[PDB]
Amino acid sequence: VDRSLLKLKMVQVVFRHGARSPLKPLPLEEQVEWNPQLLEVPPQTQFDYTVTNLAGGPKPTTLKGGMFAGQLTKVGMQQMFALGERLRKNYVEDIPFLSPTFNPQEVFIRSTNIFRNLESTRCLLAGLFQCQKEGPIIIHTDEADSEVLYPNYQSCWSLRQRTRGRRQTASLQPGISEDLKKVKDRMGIDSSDKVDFFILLDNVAAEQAHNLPSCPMLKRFARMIEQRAVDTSLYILPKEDRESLQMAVGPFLHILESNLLKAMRKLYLYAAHDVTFIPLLMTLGIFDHKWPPFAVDLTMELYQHLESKEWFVQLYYHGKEQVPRGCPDGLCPLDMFLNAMSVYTLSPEKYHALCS
Numbered sequence: 072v073d074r075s076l077l078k079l080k081m082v083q084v085v086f087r088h089g090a091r092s093p094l095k096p097l098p099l100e101e102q103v104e105w106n107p108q109l110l111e112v113p114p115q116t117q118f119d120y121t122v123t124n125l126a127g128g129p130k131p132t133t134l135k136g137g138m139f140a141g142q143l144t145k146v147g148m149q150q151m152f153a154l155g156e157r158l159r160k161n162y163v164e165d166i167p168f169l170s171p172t173f174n175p176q177e178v179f180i181r182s183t184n185i186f187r188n189l190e191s192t193r194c195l196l197a198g199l200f201q202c203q204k205e206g207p208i209i210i211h212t213d214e215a216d217s218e219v220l221y222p223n224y225q226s227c228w229s230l231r232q233r234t235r236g237r238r239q240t241a242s243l244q245p246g247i248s249e250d251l252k253k254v255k256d257r258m259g260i261d262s263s264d265k266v267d268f269f270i271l272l273d274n275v276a277a278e279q280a281h282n283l284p285s286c287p288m289l290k291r292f293a294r295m296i297e298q299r300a301v302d303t304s305l306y307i308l309p310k311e312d313r314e315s316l317q318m319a320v321g322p323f324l325h326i327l328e329s330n331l332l333k334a335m336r337k338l339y340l341y342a343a344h345d346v347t348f349i350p351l352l353m354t355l356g357i358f359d360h361k362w363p364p365f366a367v368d369l370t371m372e373l374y375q376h377l378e379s380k381e382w383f384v385q386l387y388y389h390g391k392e393q394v395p396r397g398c399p400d401g402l403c404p405l406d407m408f409l410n411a412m413s414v415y416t417l418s419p420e421k422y423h424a425l426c427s
Contacts, residue, residue: 072383072402077374079168080382081334083327085341086154086368087348088191089147090280093273094140098263103283105136109144116148116197120208122189131184131214143190146281150366151191155198157390158370162338163199169337173204182342183220184212191366192342219326219422221347222308222319227426230318234307241303242267250299257288268300272362280365297362304349313414318425320350321417327371328409328416334373335382354415356396357388364389374402384408 092105122130132140143151162168169177173196180196182188192210213219216226224231242251251268255261275293278285289296308315323343330339343351348363355369370387382405386393394400397411417425 081373083339083371088187089150089366091143093277097274102135105134105138107137116194118197143187148194151194152198155195158199173200175206177337180340181211188342219322221344237307241306254292271296272300317417324416357393
């Protein structure tokens with residue numbers, strides 16, 4: 072189709088928080104030091120916000136070195152800022168789709184209620200709007216028990232049940248087991264369980280992102296660690312199991328879809344997690360078999376053709392053009408896109424029904 076004839080209607084972004092300290096420190100005798108000066112907020116990122124419920128509405132440990140676990144750092148803040156700036160290039164500079172200043176009317180913001188995602192959202196907005204707002208910044212969040220921004224095992228009974236055996240046996244799978252044993256052995260950490268590939272990956276990725284001197288045997292195995300984390304995660308929620316993927320990412324897809332249809336707000340922002348991205352990318356047919364990186368984004372553009380009145384979407388992941396289920400390279404007709412993803416989508420009512 073002829074791009075000059077297309078008008079940008081809506082943009083949706085799903086993103087992961089930036090570089091941060093690990094959630095749980097590894098059981099190591101010698102540990103890397105995390106300097107609190109990494110928590111310094113660069114002035115270009117300082118944007119104040121209010122957290123609310125979905126309405127809304129009233130809102131719903133220490134590492135060596137004196138820094139808290141799972142905390143976005145100055146490094147992560149700069150990544151998220153950079154993400155904001157790329158969006159500004161496309162939706163502010165290249166075309167005047169969004170006002171250069173934050174407008175509550177133009178933008179809807181949602182995040183899981185966890186500090187690292189809230190601060191990442193703050194930094195993204197700071198870059199996108201260059202710290203300029205025409206009104207209060209509201210970040211909408213839901214209570215953990217209702218949250219759909221990650222697969223919710225606690226609140227969805229059937230999902231917990233369907234994955235139970237695979238959750239148990241994921242780490243005993245061929246090649247995963249032998250490799251976990253190899254790493255722990257070499258690290259001198261073995262028998263420390265529970266330490267699985269997710270905890271190893273969490274640590275190596277956080278240290279690498281910060282240029283910190285990881286344990287050498289941990290670094291030796293960094294690639295295997297990421298790969299096996301991915302294989303573990305895929306084994307638990309395989310492409311072949313439709314109902315599980317539905318209960319895992321279905322409601323979130325339903326939200327994304329609903330936004331497209333309403334557009335038939337300029338921008339929707341969703342701060343999500345790596346465990347959200349893996350199944351989301353798989354249902355979209357775009358998974359690259361890599362652990363979703365810090366600050367990674369999934370961007371959706373919705374256009375309408377001025378002559379024909381037809382609607383098209385373009386999908387990007389990590390700045391790269393993607394081809395989803397049901398779509399040709401380039402602009403994908405909205406019906407083709409939505410019809411393909413309909414297999415994975417779950418209305419809130421069907422979701423609630425399926426979960427019990």
